[PDB]
Design a protein around this nucleic acid. Structure first.
Lengths: 119, 267, 125, 108, 130
RNA sequence: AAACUUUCAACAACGGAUCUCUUGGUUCUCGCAUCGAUGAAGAACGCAGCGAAAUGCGAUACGUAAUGUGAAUUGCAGAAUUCCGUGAAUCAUCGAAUCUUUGAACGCACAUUGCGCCCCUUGGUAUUCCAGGGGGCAUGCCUGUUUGAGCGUCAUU
RNA sequence: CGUGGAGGUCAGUGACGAAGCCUAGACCGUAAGGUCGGGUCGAACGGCCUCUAGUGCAGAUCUUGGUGGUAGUAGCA
RNA sequence: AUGGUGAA
RNA sequence: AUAUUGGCGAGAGACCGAUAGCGAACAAGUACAGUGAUGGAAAGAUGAAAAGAACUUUGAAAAGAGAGUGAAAAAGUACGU
RNA sequence: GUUUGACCUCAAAUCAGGUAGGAGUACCCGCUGAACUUAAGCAUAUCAAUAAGCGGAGGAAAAGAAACCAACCGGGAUUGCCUUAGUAACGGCGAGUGAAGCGGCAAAAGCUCAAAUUUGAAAUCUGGUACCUUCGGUGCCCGAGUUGUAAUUUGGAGAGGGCAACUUUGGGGCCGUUCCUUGUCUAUGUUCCUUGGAACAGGACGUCAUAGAGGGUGAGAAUCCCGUGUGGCGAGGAGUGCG
């Protein structure tokens, strides 16, 4: 009983919009019929079915936005990695590993050698 | 959460009694008009007691047990080094049993050596009372030839009747079980087969469980379908054990606490 | 003896871990041994228990009685074997809460992942 | 009122720290080759102790260069001076012996 | 505590980390010859004495060659640019081996390098070529 | 003598001591660094077939998707599941989602669930207007960008 | 002499009833207390050689909890 | 005394 | 290398064992009191399994009486001793 | 040219990209700062370079490569511990206050600017934009920047050249190891008897042990279940440590 996620992934924009209208109306029907019944099971399955359809729909918008912002500098804030605040500040891998030109020459000329001490 | 639990179930118990009996007051009112409706309740709804839910020859009569042919002589002895209460108990058996001789038992004469004497002196039964401490505890009836032998346990003795010299009438209750009617057989044999009707003395042997109660009473007949009876003689409770089959060599039943686990059966 | 520093021999930590275990961990904690016939066939000592498999009760008042598991009550750490039932005073039937360590499996319920579980543990179906 | 309950704990801490430094700096001897130095003040001048770093002079007399000395694990100090002759001799002998012992691996 | 009380109470769970065994048994990482010859049952200092190599170069506070030969085994085992080579061809064919004329030359030797610079580069050129 | 008062004993009451337990506390040690304008900590309003706190969650509301496990959940009622599989579960994991009203609180405001503005807009011919859907409009400061202003300075056959 | 816990020991005791609780019950110790019988109970506990301490109560207009006499009294406007 | 809350 | 009564996650104790131990082992910073800043408790244990006493009967209800489950109700949601 | 054009300055915008506030606060860094109390009343000594308040940080912070300590056959960044030591020293010499160098150890690591010209070529960087193998690279355009951005130098010196028939040499993937997270497999009685409701107890008879830690199971279970012990098979990540 209820919808399946993988089945809804193949569907179009209009088909999922149509499915959403069907499920929203069907749920509104059962809330009217709720007073007639002491027990009603389908009200739970439909609520979760609306939730599942909405998740697939919202996924399709977000993947479409990511496709139109394909590898360009400064894409929107709602698509960037959350991580934390401090890690969104603080120098990147490249920026931290960025060394002055003199130290790069001193690294080449005299690197930290590997040795053992006995025989 | 005791403080939550305490209020919730006290109220639920309070709620249930109201509902239980309001149902019953309506039951009472419908029963006033129609007597027939009450009748059907009693059929379906059963009290379901333990008794209701219990989990389910002529040559013998003479050969193992004493019949109405002789006076049976009963060799009443006591366990070695017994005190006042045992002889006090022997004085209660001196009245009730037919032809008792009390034998002061003086150390030795193991058991078979006793049997040799009571063959020569020609007794029928041996009865021995024992004491662990100051209270009486066990009673052992043996039949002298062949040896069907019954052991018993006493847990009750309390002492306003004061009886006559007239010989009491027997009565037994609930011996459906074959092991029950072999004990019923013992008390049919060991007690007198005289009943003199006048003197009005009755000895019972009621057995509704595995516990047997014996009492004495005085019965007065009024012609209005009823009889009165006063308490007389010793209060008593017995428990069957062993059925040693030989003089003391063999067993047939021997109580274990492996029973009581069933809550039923009743032998 | 404890050698690892990761594992704890504390009573307080261990009892809490058991009583506040999730349903998935309680599946493994409710394991039953197999009978000597199945141990000879499958080459495995013990498995977690499920519904549609048969069982024989070894220890308790219901000693030697057998049947088929109705429902694994994981919350109460219990199984409820059908036809191993205590009759109430009102004529109704209430199942006895048995524990799967006391049980012994006689006839398994082989599914696909169950077959894979046997094959993982060194089995030969 | 502080109590050092962690005397046993921090020794195990320090030992495991040396164990990690051994694991990461695999063939090398954890610490740098320190000099031999005469202690200051009339009270302690008889004592000869481990100094901080060598000198450019002691390093130059040994047969290696200052920048290269640090890469082979010789602690080099630049503010220390070579006033004493016996200390200078002892340190030069210490380095030359050390240079005979070392086996500096190729960069290929 | 205030915050810890919630974390024990919640159905979120705790970020359980078992990382106490790894703090002792540390794997060696920087040398393969050592990676084969290192008894983890032994300590640091005991492993060094077993190998031969010194664990400490100072006199230690307190109290107390199968592998080293294999290290000596691994101890047993630049061109010039196209323009530079072609430029040196121009100099050699013009003068020969007159380095004084070669450095006083203006047209071919533009960057006014010394005799020692030009001859060194010609020696390297004469190795790869004639 | 009974009753009455007192003393003792027995059996009931009252009370929760003692004993035993313990998903709690306290202290010591070890390891790690991890909140917030991408809107936190906190407050409020709600959400389950049937719920007080707690716990979870936000009109996708004691959850949705994903991954693993492999067949429950269970206080009660009631649905389910093809159970040789895209799959039961108040399961575990958790990276994708939604994320009400607020709160550093951020359109203007005071304590107004008021007072608005612009962009995008599906519908009611919508050329008038009417309604719906959705995202923005706080302050300071930096790097820019841009339309300017300035007898502020100079050039000008 | 006694109490909570620790090391050691008694291959100690213990669902055939540990600990506790009573008892017009018995014995020992000058005593602190120890031991035993009977009754009630339901799961751990004790002697011995040592260790350790939040260790022994009649009082503090003691703290907490419980229960009396006052009293079916003053009282309910 | 420090810091805060209230106030005919 | 050093500090650390917070946080995150462990491992422990010759520690305390429900008037102790954190104020809080439980609908605890809750109930509640204070205009407010703030102050702030009490309260753990049925059994192995609810098998939580069906059913008859006494009463409008409140509780009883028969009867039963359980090893024990001499364990009853007023629940171990 | 009574136009126009350079700059400098002040503006602007619901433009583009950012960022700061608040919570927590044991530790740390600053700022501010009482009183009860001690010597006899209290101005210092004394509570106290405290508590409260204020501001600011981090996994530590702070400190730190000498304008240092010393008086020696000199030491040699800083931090901490032991000791120096209750010493020197100060204190109506009294309540008392209270170091430091040396020595032993823990841990060890050093360097970057400003300074005289790249002047035979601003060699530098931001941003926008187009692609690419995207914690970034490249082309192109724009701006900053000569009121100085790069390379070279920091006293240990250093630079300019010349001589050595001097010596050395980058960077990117791939599969492993390693580190983090996570999954999975790995021994042996439910053998008899007694007692009890129940066996996990007593007794008899055996096995396993690199597993007789612990917890569960109807009472004290190595051998019933989960684990524990020794190993093995993986999955997903990190990564410059090296193979």
């Amino acid at each position: 009983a209820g919808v399946k996620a993988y089945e809804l992934r193949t569907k179009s924009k209009e088909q999922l919009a149509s499915q959403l209208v069907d499920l929203k109306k069907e749920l509104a029907e059962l809330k009217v019929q709720k007073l007639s019944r002491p027990s009603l099971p389908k009200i739970k399955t439909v609520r979760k079915s609306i939730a599942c359809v909405l998740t697939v729909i919202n996924e399709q918008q977000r993947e479409a936005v990511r496709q139109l912002y394909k590898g360009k500098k400064y894409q929107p804030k709602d698509l960037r990695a959350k991580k934390t605040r401090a890690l969104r500040r603080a120098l990147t891998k490249f920026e931290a590993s960025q060394v002055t030109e003199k130290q790069r020459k001193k690294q080449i000329a005299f690197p930290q050698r590997k040795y053992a001490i006995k025989a | 959460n005791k403080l939550k639990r305490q209020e919730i179930f006290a109220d639920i118990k309070h709620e249930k009694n109201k509902e239980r009996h309001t149902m019953r007051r309506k039951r009472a009112k419908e029963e006033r008009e129609n007597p027939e409706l009450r009748e059907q309740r009693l059929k379906e709804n059963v009290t379901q007691t333990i008794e209701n839910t219990r989990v389910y020859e002529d040559d013998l009569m003479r050969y193992f047990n004493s019949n109405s042919n002789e006076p049976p002589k009963i060799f009443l002895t006591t366990n070695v080094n017994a005190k006042k209460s045992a002889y006090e108990f022997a004085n209660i058996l001196i009245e009730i049993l037919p032809n008792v001789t009390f034998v002061k038992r003086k150390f030795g004469y193991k058991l078979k050596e006793i049997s040799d004497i009571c063959i020569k002196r020609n007794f029928t039964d041996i009865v021995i009372i024992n004491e662990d401490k100051k209270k009486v505890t066990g009673l052992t009836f043996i039949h002298l030839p062949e040896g069907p032998t019954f052991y018993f346990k006493l847990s009750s003795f309390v002492e306003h009747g004061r009886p006559t010299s007239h010989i009491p009438e027997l009565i037994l209750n609930n011996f459906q079980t074959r092991l029950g009617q072999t004990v019923g057989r013992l008390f049919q044999s060991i007690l007198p087969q005289n009943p003199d009707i006048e003197g009005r003395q009755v000895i019972t042997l009621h057995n509704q469980r595995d516990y047997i109660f014996f009492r004495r009473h005085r019965y007065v007949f009024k012609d209005n379908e009823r009889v009165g009876l006063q308490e007389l003689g010793p209060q008593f409770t017995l428990k069957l054990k062993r059925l040693q089959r030989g003089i003391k060599e063999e067993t047939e039943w021997e109580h274990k606490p492996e029973m009581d686990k069933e809550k039923k059966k009743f032998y | 003896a404890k050698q690892s520093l990761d594992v704890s021999s504390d009573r307080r930590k261990a009892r809490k871990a058991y009583f506040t275990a999730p349903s998935s961990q309680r599946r493994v904690l409710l394991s039953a041994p197999l009978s000597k016939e199945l141990r000879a066939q499958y080459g495995i000592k013990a498995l977690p228990i499920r519904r549609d498999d048969e069982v024989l009760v070894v220890r308790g008042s219901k000693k030697g009685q057998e049947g088929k598991i109705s429902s694994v009550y994981r919350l109460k750490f219990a199984v409820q074997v059908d036809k191993v039932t205590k009759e109430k005073v009102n004529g109704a039937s209430v199942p006895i809460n048995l524990h799967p360590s006391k049980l012994v499996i006689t006839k398994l319920h082989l599914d696909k992942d169950r077959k894979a579980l046997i094959q993982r543990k060194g089995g030969k179906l | 009122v502080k109590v050092h309950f962690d005397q046993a704990g921090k020794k195990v801490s320090r030992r495991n720290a040396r164990a990690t430094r051994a694991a990461k700096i695999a063939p090398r001897p954890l610490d740098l080759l320190r000099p031999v130095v005469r202690a200051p003040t009339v009270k302690y001048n008889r004592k000869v102790r481990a100094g901080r770093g060598f000198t450019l002079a002691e390093v130059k007399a040994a047969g290696l260069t200052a920048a290269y000395a640090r890469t082979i694990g010789i602690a080099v100090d630049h503010r220390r001076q070579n006033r004493n002759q016996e200390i200078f001799d002892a340190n030069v002998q210490r380095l030359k012996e050390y240079q005979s012992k070392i086996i500096v691996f190729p960069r290929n | 505590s205030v915050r810890k009380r919630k974390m024990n109470r919640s159905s979120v769970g705790k970020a359980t980390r078992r990382n106490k065994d790894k703090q002792r048994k540390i794997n060696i990482q920087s040398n393969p010859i050592i990676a084969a010859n290192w008894d983890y049952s032994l300590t640091m200092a005991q492993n060094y004495k077993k190998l031969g190599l010194r664990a400490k170069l100072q006199t230690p506070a307190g109290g107390k060659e199968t592998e080293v030969v294999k290290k000596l085994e691994e101890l047993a085992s630049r061109s010039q640019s196209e323009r530079e080579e072609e430029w040196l061809e121009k100099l050699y064919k013009k003068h020969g081996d007159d380095y004084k004329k070669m450095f006083f030359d203006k047209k071919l030797n533009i960057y006014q390098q010394s005799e020692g610079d030009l001859k060194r580069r010609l020696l390297r050129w004469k190795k790869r070529n004639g």
